[PDB]
């Protein structure tokens, strides 16, 4: 179903128990220690970062 923060990039991805994607987010201005796993619905138009991670360019 959280406060908005700017995303720098996507570090990793995985499937949850329900078969949907979750993404490990690198938050702009923060280090790897603060990365969090977030479901798709928490990302607001992050298609560019998802494409970069998947290699689409």
């Amino acid at each position: 179903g959280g406060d908005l923060y700017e995303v720098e990039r996507i570090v990793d991805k995985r499937k949850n128990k329900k078969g949907k994607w979750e993404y490990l987010i690198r938050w702009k201005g923060y280090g790897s220690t603060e990365d969090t796993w977030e479901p798709e619905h928490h990302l607001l138009h992050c298609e560019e970062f998802i494409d970069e991670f998947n290699g689409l360019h």
Binding site: Y5, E6, I25, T36, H42, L44, H45, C46, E48, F49
Partner: peptide, 9 residues
Amino acid sequence: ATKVARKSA
């Protein structure tokens, strides 16, 4: 909005 996301606890 683009390139932002909601962050969990």
